[PDB]
Amino acid sequence: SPALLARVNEKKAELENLKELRDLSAAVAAQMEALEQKLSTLSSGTEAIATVLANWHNVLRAISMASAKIPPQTLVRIP
Amino acid sequence: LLSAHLEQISISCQGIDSLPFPPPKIFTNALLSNPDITSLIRDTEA
C-alpha cells in the first residue's frame, strides 16, 4: 500500500511529463503549419524571378530571330 | 630617287584612300534615329 502510494507519485510525475510532451507536440505541428506558409511565400518569390527569366528569354529569342535574318504586319499582343 | 619619292607617295596615297573604311553598313544609327513602324531592319539605301 505505501509502496503503491509511491508508485502513484511516480505515475504523477510521468503524467506531468507526458502532458508537457503533448503540449510540445502540438506546438511542433503549429510550427510546421507556419513553416509551410513561409515556404509558400518563398516559392512565390521564386516564381516572380521565373517571370524575369521569361522576359529576358523572349528578348534573346526575339533578337536572334531579327539577328538571324538571312533571306510583315504590325499585329502583336499588348496586355 | 626622284621617281622613287613620287612612287612612294603615290603608293601611300593609294593604300590610304583605298582603305575600306567602315561605311554606313550600320543598323544602330537608323535603329535609334528613325523611330518608325517595326520591321527587321530597313537601311535607307535610297
Curated annotation (Swiss-Prot), chain A:
UniProt GO cellular component terms: cytoplasm; DASH complex; kinetochore; microtubule; mitotic spindle; mitotic spindle midzone; mitotic spindle pole body
Subcellular location: Chromosome, Centromere, Kinetochore; Cytoplasm, Cytoskeleton, Spindle; Nucleus
Keyword Membrane: no
Entry's Gene Ontology BP terms: attachment of mitotic spindle microtubules to kinetochore; attachment of spindle microtubules to kinetochore; cell division; mitotic sister chromatid biorientation; protein transport along microtubule to mitotic spindle pole body
Main location: nucleus
Alphabetical UniProt keywords: Cell cycle, Cell division, Centromere, Chromosome, Chromosome partition, Cytoplasm, Cytoskeleton, Kinetochore, Microtubule, Mitosis, Nucleus
Superkingdom of the source species: Eukaryota
Subunit relationships: Component of the DASH complex consisting of ASK1, DAD1, DAD2, DAD3, DAD4, DAM1, DUO1, HSK3, SPC19 and SPC34, with a stoichiometry of one copy of each subunit per complex. Multiple DASH complexes oligomerize to form a ring that encircles spindle microtubules and organizes the rod-like NDC80 complexes of the outer kinetochore. DASH complex oligomerization strengthens microtubule attachments. On cytoplasmic microtubules, DASH complexes appear to form patches instead of rings.
UniProt family annotation: Belongs to the DASH complex DAD2 family.
Function: Component of the DASH complex that connects microtubules with kinetochores and couples microtubule depolymerisation to chromosome movement; it is involved in retrieving kinetochores to the spindle poles before their re-orientation on the spindle in early mitosis and allows microtubule depolymerization to pull chromosomes apart and resist detachment during anaphase.
Name of the molecule in the record: DASH complex subunit DAD2
Encoding gene, per UniProt annotation: DAD2
Shown part of the complete sequence: 25 to 116 of 138
UniProtKB/Swiss-Prot annotation, chain B:
Domain of life, per lineage: Eukaryota
Localisation per UniProt entry: Nucleus; Cytoplasm, Cytoskeleton, Spindle; Chromosome, Centromere, Kinetochore
Family: Belongs to the DASH complex SPC34 family.
Record note on quaternary structure: Component of the DASH complex consisting of ASK1, DAD1, DAD2, DAD3, DAD4, DAM1, DUO1, HSK3, SPC19 and SPC34, with a stoichiometry of one copy of each subunit per complex. Multiple DASH complexes oligomerize to form a ring that encircles spindle microtubules and organizes the rod-like NDC80 complexes of the outer kinetochore of the outer kinetochore. DASH complex oligomerization strengthens microtubule attachments. On cytoplasmic microtubules, DASH complexes appear to form patches instead of rings.
Role noted for this protein: Component of the DASH complex that connects microtubules with kinetochores and couples microtubule depolymerisation to chromosome movement; it is involved in retrieving kinetochores to the spindle poles before their re-orientation on the spindle in early mitosis and allows microtubule depolymerization to pull chromosomes apart and resist detachment during anaphase.
Annotated protein name in UniProt: DASH complex subunit SPC34
Source organism per UniProt: Chaetomium thermophilum (strain DSM 1495 / CBS 144.50 / IMI 039719)
Section of the entire sequence shown: 3 to 48 of 255
